[PDB]
Amino acid sequence: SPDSAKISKEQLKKLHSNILNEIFSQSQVNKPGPLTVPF
Amino acid sequence: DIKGTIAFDTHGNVIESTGVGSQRIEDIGDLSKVTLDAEGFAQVQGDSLLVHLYKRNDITLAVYTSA
Amino acid sequence: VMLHSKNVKGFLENTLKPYDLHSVDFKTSSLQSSMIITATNGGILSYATSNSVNNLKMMSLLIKDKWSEDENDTNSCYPVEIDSFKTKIYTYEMEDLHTCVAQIPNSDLLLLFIAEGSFPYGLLVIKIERAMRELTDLFGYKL
């Protein structure tokens, strides 16, 4: 596969990692506490 | 310059899209059939716009630029 | 065992938050609603909204049955594993809305996300899979 000066392989890969990192970071949700009783 | 992006998963469902990417969601059918090189890269194009593909972790990234 | 109502509610409210990316110029709206419902009757145990209460009860029972029909008829389906526990994530187009539903592993409960038709399904699926990872307390919850 060719490389391009429009967007290089390194840049493209890096942009892929950024999108994934952001999505997985923003996919975390905190529970306020235990969801069952008793503990 | 980057004219758009689409990210999509192995079922062909979109994860995100921007620029011309949002106008070309139908491209995914063809794009998802592209066989990537040993490092996960490919370049294809339907028209005047060049699609740069990279796939890792079951997610394909397509960015649109000119050719 | 019983559910801590207020904390489950708080958990669902947290699942509502939109994605907002800066690497690319991309942002979703927040979820329309997020619910935990019974796999058995489709009854709502808890919910959070960012439309109306009447509307959620209908959709919930509908998705329960659709899920129930798919889960034993010998669309997108995503097999997932969480700490060796298996479940499946289903997408359903509910009119102009995008939904994801999955059984909380080994439980009698389903987790249900309801989003607008502009919320990408692949992203919705990721959101619900990661959310499910925070629900280990409810694995095996039996009615």
Swiss-Prot record, chain A:
<comment type="function">
    <text>Component of the GSE complex, a GTPase complex required for intracellular sorting of GAP1 out of the endosome. Component of the EGO complex, a complex involved in the regulation of microautophagy.</text>
</comment>
<protein>
    <recommendedName>
        <fullName>Protein MEH1</fullName>
    </recommendedName>
</protein>
<comment type="subunit">
    <text>Component of the GSE complex composed of GTR1, GTR2, SLM4, MEH1 and LTV1. Component of the EGO complex, at least composed of GTR2, SLM4 and MEH1.</text>
</comment>
<feature type="modified residue" description="Phosphoserine">
    <location>
        <position position="1"/>
    </location>
</feature>
<feature type="modified residue" description="Phosphoserine">
    <location>
        <position position="4"/>
    </location>
</feature>
Curated annotation (Swiss-Prot), chain B:
<dbReference type="GO" id="GO:0032008">
    <property type="term" value="P:positive regulation of TOR signaling"/>
</dbReference>
<dbReference type="GO" id="GO:0072665">
    <property type="term" value="P:protein localization to vacuole"/>
</dbReference>
<dbReference type="Pfam" id="PF11503">
    <property type="entry name" value="YNR034W-A-like"/>
</dbReference>
<dbReference type="GO" id="GO:0016237">
    <property type="term" value="P:microautophagy"/>
</dbReference>
<dbReference type="InterPro" id="IPR021591">
    <property type="entry name" value="YNR034W-A/EGO2"/>
</dbReference>
<protein>
    <recommendedName>
        <fullName>Protein EGO2</fullName>
    </recommendedName>
</protein>
<dbReference type="GO" id="GO:0038202">
    <property type="term" value="P:TORC1 signaling"/>
</dbReference>
<dbReference type="GO" id="GO:0000329">
    <property type="term" value="C:fungal-type vacuole membrane"/>
</dbReference>
<dbReference type="InterPro" id="IPR035098">
    <property type="entry name" value="YNR034W-A/EGO2_sf"/>
</dbReference>
<dbReference type="GO" id="GO:0071986">
    <property type="term" value="C:Ragulator complex"/>
</dbReference>
Swiss-Prot record, chain C:
<dbReference type="GO" id="GO:0032456">
    <property type="term" value="P:endocytic recycling"/>
</dbReference>
<comment type="function">
    <text>Component of the GSE complex, a GTPase complex required for intracellular sorting of GAP1 out of the endosome. Component of the EGO complex, a complex involved in the regulation of microautophagy.</text>
</comment>
<dbReference type="GO" id="GO:0042802">
    <property type="term" value="F:identical protein binding"/>
</dbReference>
<keyword id="KW-0812">Transmembrane</keyword>
<keyword id="KW-0813">Transport</keyword>
<protein>
    <recommendedName>
        <fullName>Protein SLM4</fullName>
    </recommendedName>
</protein>
<keyword id="KW-1133">Transmembrane helix</keyword>
<comment type="subunit">
    <text>Component of the GSE complex composed of GTR1, GTR2, SLM4, MEH1 and LTV1. Component of the EGO complex, at least composed of GTR2, SLM4 and MEH1.</text>
</comment>
<dbReference type="Pfam" id="PF16818">
    <property type="entry name" value="SLM4"/>
</dbReference>
<keyword id="KW-0653">Protein transport</keyword>
<dbReference type="GO" id="GO:0031902">
    <property type="term" value="C:late endosome membrane"/>
</dbReference>
<feature type="transmembrane region" description="Helical">
    <location>
        <begin position="109"/>
        <end position="126"/>
    </location>
</feature>
<keyword id="KW-0072">Autophagy</keyword>
<dbReference type="GO" id="GO:0007165">
    <property type="term" value="P:signal transduction"/>
</dbReference>
<dbReference type="GO" id="GO:0071986">
    <property type="term" value="C:Ragulator complex"/>
</dbReference>
